[PDB]
Amino acid sequence: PQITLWKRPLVTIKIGGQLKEALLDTGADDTVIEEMSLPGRWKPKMIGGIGGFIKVRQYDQIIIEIAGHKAIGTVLVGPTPVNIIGRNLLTQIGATLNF
Amino acid sequence: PQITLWKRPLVTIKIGGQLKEALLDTGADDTVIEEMSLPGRWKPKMIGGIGGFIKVRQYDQIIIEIAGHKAIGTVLVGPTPVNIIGRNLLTQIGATLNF
Ligand SMILES: COc1ccc(S(=O)(=O)N(CC(C)C)C[C@@H](O)[C@H](Cc2ccccc2)NC(=O)O[C@H]2C[C@H]3OC(=O)N(c4ccccc4)[C@H]3C2)cc1
Ligand SMILES: [Cl-]
Ligand SMILES: [Cl-]
Ligand SMILES: [Cl-]
Ligand SMILES: [Cl-]
Ligand code: NA
Ligand code: NA
């Protein structure tokens, strides 16, 4: 689809067998999801932006479905205020900015 | 242009006769830029980022050129790590997200 930006670009994702709402976020290098369980190995990481840093768990090789498009990549899990799909997964669904 | 997301979507902006680098950010409701001098009155605003909330200064009706596209709108000024062009000005320049 072509998404205009009058409203937040929210989509439905499937991750870890669960459906969630997430924001397509071109300004995020990384995908960050609210607290949830994922299978497999993780490591701790600190990420920062406006307001400072949070501690997250880094899960690698996680399959996700984003508005019906499958991808795989790293997912950071922790106390983010909103689920964000960052560039690491937006590339995999072929997302571009057009003007 | 069509901008892929393999790299950060950085562009040059011009505000108060000064060139700056900024991110085209579909996850930002509003435009937020690093401390600088702007004309006119400002109003208080609280914005929430990945690590919590910060206070910024809201300046309305500011002239800003974004990747060569003229916009006139709201600019938030405060302690952001990176200059961010948010949806308020992405809509003005006719940007869409496409996949
Ligand atoms: C109301 O208007 C606004 C309210 C909030 C914002 S926001 O907090 O910037 N944010 C609102 C979303 C959080 C929901 C827009 C969002 O795209 C920001 C934009 C941004 C902010 C600060 C530093 C870098 C990039 N991305 C962002 O938080 O990504 C986090 C996930 C990582 O991906 C990065 O690219 N990060 C990074 C951090 C530091 C330096 C370089 C990269 C890490 C942080 C902007 C506008
Ligand atoms: Cl909205
Ligand atoms: Cl990845
Ligand atoms: Cl591509
Ligand atoms: Cl505006
Ligand atoms: Na893994
Ligand atoms: Na003004």
The domains located in chain A, with CATH, are 1-99 (2.40.70.10)
CA of B26 to the centre of ligand 7 (A): 24
Sign of CA dihedral B81, B86, B88, B92: positive
Burial B6-25 (b: 16+ CB within 10 A, else e): eebbebebebeeeeeebbbb
Report strand pairing: B84-85 vs B69-77: unpaired
Choose among B23, B51, B97: nearest Cβ to A9. Answer: B97
Answer yes or no: are the C-beta atoms of A11 and A85 closer than 8 Å: yes
**Contact pairs from chain A to chain B, CB under 8 Å:** 137
Experimental resolution (Å):
1.3
Query: How far apart are alpha carbons A89 and B18 in whole angstroms?
Result: 34
Which 3 state secondary structure label does DSSP give B91?
helix
Q: What are the pocket residues of ligand 1 if the criterion is a CB atom closer than 6 Å to any ligand atom?
A: A 25, 27-30, 32, 47-50, 82, 84, 86; B 25, 27-30, 32, 47, 49-50, 81-82, 84, 86
CA distance A52 to chain B (A): 4
Answer yes or no: are the C-beta atoms of B91 and A6 closer than 8 Å: yes
Nearest-by-CA chain B residue for A80? B50
Cβ neighbours of residue A66 closer than 8 Å, sequence gap 6 or more:
A11, A13, A22, A85, A89, A93
- Pick the closest to residue A80 from A54, A42, A50, A45 (CA basis): A54
Neighbours of A3 (CB within 10 A): 19
Reading the block at residue A62, the tokens are 């996680």
- Pick the closest to residue A90 from A18, A36, A22, A40 (CA basis): A22
Phi, psi (deg, nearest 5) at residue A91:
-60, -40
Answer yes or no: are the C-beta atoms of B98 and A67 closer than 8 Å: no
**H helix or E strand, kind and range, residue A90:** helix A87-90
Q: Do B98 and A95 make contact, defined as CB atoms within 8 angstroms?
A: yes
* DSSP 8-state symbol, B87: H
Where does residue A45 rank: exposed (0-12), middle (13-18), buried (19+ CB within 10 A)? middle
- Which residues of chain A lie closer than 8 angstroms to B71, CB-CB? none
- Pick the closest to residue A78 from A31, A39, A21 (CA basis): A31
Would you call A25 a catalytic residue per the annotation?
yes
Answer yes or no: are the C-beta atoms of A7 and A56 closer than 8 Å: no
Q: Is A10 at the interface with chain B, CB within 8 A?
A: no
Phi, psi (deg, nearest 5) at residue A87:
-60, -35
Task: Name the H helices within B1-99.
Answer: 87-92
Q: How was this structure determined?
A: X-ray
